[PDB]
Ligand binder design. Structure first.
Ligand SMILES: Nc1ncnc2c1ncn2[C@@H]1O[C@H](COP(=O)(O)OP(=O)(O)O)[C@@H](O)[C@H]1O
Lengths: 72, 360, 74, 51, 72
């Protein structure tokens, strides 16, 4: 909230304005590296994506069960 | 015709009397400028106290007419003006429900506690703790002094936070619990104020039980160098001890503590007579794991089988709290095969990864 | 005797320099030279004692001073 | 009379301001020196009649 | 790193925020965090507690068959 300089009292709310050193970390799609560019690791990427895009798209297989889902 | 033109007006006016009183309220507040917050060290006379602000210094002050000089004592939180620095008002109950919260139904006297793993413990704490609370007028005339406190040590990953939460709930005791993190995480140098409030609040709601984990955090330096920078890590042990000594151990307040590293504990106190009874705790065995897996796995749409028996016999060197993971270690493969009712094949290869997970 | 009343401010004596002047490094953070007043002891000050000051002057005013075993041979 | 002089002199100048403390680094040409206030930074100064 | 100094506190107090941030939301809102490191015998297990960062990947060295892919 906003507040006076001498008589500290609430005066007006205000949003959460983020810092420039954080918005910067938002990203383009400058990355250009397909999963064919990487060798081995068919498992680890297979294990990974069963934590990421499916919960992003196909979480119903979790949510119908409603199992204790993973976070990261 | 000329009646409706007026009938909208009696509505109009009252729709302003609401409006006015608000705009007249706020100005009645803006003159009442802000204040400043402190805390007390000691007392000298009704004309002069001492304070300690929330921005350093240790002023000396006086006090206004209205407030009772009685309630003003040590530990209290205080408010006062900016120029003259004269104390007027108090605010107790430094609420932080993320810290603690009551379990009144734990004063039910018939509550459920039927998870698996452990029976003689819940059987014996009932001996350790029931009798001094319900009719303790006998421990005196027999002669002995009952235990002011308890300690519950063991290995990590065992699910004891829910245990102590439970057995004080079946007995019909008012249970409250606060970790020793936020009191030192949220509150760096304003901590021990919470301690004494955590007891006074607990007192007038007598009887009641305490529980508090991560208790090895109070140590900090533990006077590792005796410098005056760790006063928080020092005093936070002090106010703990002085308060628990103040109970008189009558039988309407008892205390529980816990950690993994009792060899890391601070026996500067809490060893001799405060946390007198020390109690280790075991891990499961050839059937407890089915007493455990009958809990979590029972709560999800599997196929329905009893590979548990042939399973756990393959399991060994197995801690306790890795079991919420073990089921979901398999749940992450049922959905892969696009399934609803899983099979034990996920379970027969469940731990096959998990055993390597214990490596690091 | 008036200024000796409230609202004072704390400090911490360090050392004297004269019969009627000493120094302080208060809790507020900084260090100040300051003159003691008479009608006051002197014998009781030289260490890092506790003290009380007058706010605006940052003067000096007056002094201020401040397990349980239960067993017996029976 | 000389009694009431003192207390009326003394009380005149407990109302007087504070007085800081610091240490010398060197001396600028004349009627000019420099000091560091021992917690804080630098402050060139002047001096008085006597010194 | 137990201490009362400035530099020892302000560091870890960040971590104390990270945890409360992980345990503040749920598996309904569709974030998904991950991480990385060259070390595991150095870092605090509170992050590894059940719920926050549970799924792990033991990126190994590559087997000799994988050596053929990478060069090509
Ligand atoms: N005996 C048990 N019965 C059921 N669940 C258990 C048991 N022991 C551990 N757990 C599981 O472990 C977690 C609780 O462990 P936790 O309270 O963190 O142990 P600690 O308090 O020693 O750190 C819960 O997810 C719980 O399901």
């Amino acid at each position: 909230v906003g507040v006076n300089k001498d008589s500290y009292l609430i005066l007006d709310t205000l949003p959460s304005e983020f810092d420039s050193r954080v918005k910067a970390m938002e990203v383009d799609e400058k990355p250009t590296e397909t999963y064919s560019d990487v060798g081995g690791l068919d498992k680890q990427i297979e294990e990974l994506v069963e934590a990421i895009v499916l919960p992003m798209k196909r979480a119903d297989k979790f949510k119908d069960m409603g199992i204790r889902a993973p976070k990261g | 015709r000329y009646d409706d033109q007026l009938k909208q007006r009696r509505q109009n006016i009252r729709d302003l009397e609401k409006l006015y009183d608000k705009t007249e309220n706020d100005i009645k507040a803006l003159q009442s400028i802000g204040q400043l917050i402190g805390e007390v060290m000691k007392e000298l006379s009704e004309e002069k106290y001492i304070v300690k602000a929330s921005s350093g210094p240790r002023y000396i002050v006086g006090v206004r007419n209205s407030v009772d000089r009685s309630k003003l004592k040590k530990g209290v939180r205080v408010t006062l003006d900016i120029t003259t620095l004269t104390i007027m008002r108090i605010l107790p109950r430094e609420t932080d429900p993320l810290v603690y919260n009551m379990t009144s139904f734990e004063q039910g006297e018939i509550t459920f506690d039927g998870i698996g793993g452990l029976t003689e413990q819940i059987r014996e704490l009932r001996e350790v703790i029931e009798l001094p609370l319900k009719n303790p007028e006998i421990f005196q005339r027999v002669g002995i002094k009952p235990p002011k406190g308890v300690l519950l040590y063991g290995p990590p990953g065992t699910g004891k936070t829910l245990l102590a939460k439970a057995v004080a709930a079946t007995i019909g005791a008012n249970f409250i619990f606060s970790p020793a993190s936020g009191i030192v995480d949220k509150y760096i140098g304003e901590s021990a104020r919470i301690i004494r409030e955590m007891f006074a609040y607990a007192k007038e709601h007598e009887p009641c039980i305490i529980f508090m984990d991560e208790v090895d955090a109070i140590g900090g330096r533990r006077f590792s160098e005796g410098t005056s920078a760790d006063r928080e890590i020092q005093r936070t042990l002090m106010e703990l001890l002085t308060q628990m000594d103040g109970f008189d151990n009558l039988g309407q307040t008892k205390i529980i503590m816990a950690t993994n590293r009792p060899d890391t504990l601070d026996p500067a106190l809490l060893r001799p007579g405060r946390l007198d009874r020390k109690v280790e705790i075991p891990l499961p065995n050839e059937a407890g794991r089915l007493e455990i897996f009958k809990i979590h796995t029972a709560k999800v749409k599997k196929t329905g089988e009893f590979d548990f028996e042939a399973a756990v016999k393959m399991s060994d060197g197995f801690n306790g709290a890795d079991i919420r993971n073990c089921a979901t270690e398999a749940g992450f493969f049922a959905i892969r095969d696009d399934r609803d009712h899983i099979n034990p094949d996920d379970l027969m290869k469940a731990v096959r990864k998990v055993a390597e997970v214990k490596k690091l | 005797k008036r200024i000796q009343s409230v609202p004072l401010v704390i400090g911490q004596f360090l050392e004297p320099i004269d019969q009627n002047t000493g120094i302080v490094s208060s809790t507020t953070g900084m260090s100040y030279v300051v003159r003691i007043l008479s009608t006051l002891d002197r014998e009781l000050l030289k260490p890092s004692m506790s003290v009380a000051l007058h706010r605006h002057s940052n003067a000096l005013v007056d002094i201020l001073p401040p397990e349980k075993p239960d067993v017996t041979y029976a | 009379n000389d009694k009431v002089r003192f207390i009326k002199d003394e009380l005149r100048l407990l109302q007087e301001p504070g007085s800081y403390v610091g240490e010398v680094i060197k001396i600028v040409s004349d009627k000019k020196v420099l000091v560091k206030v021992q917690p804080e930074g630098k402050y060139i100064v002047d001096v008085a009649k006597d010194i | 790193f137990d201490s009362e100094k400035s530099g020892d506190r302000e560091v870890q107090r960040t971590m104390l925020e990270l945890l409360n941030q992980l345990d503040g939301f749920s598996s309904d809102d569709r974030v998904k965090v991950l991480a990385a490191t060259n070390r595991v015998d150095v870092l605090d297990p509170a992050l590894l507690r059940s719920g926050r960062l549970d799924r792990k990947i033991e990126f190994p060295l590559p087997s000799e068959d994988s050596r053929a892919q990478i060069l090509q």
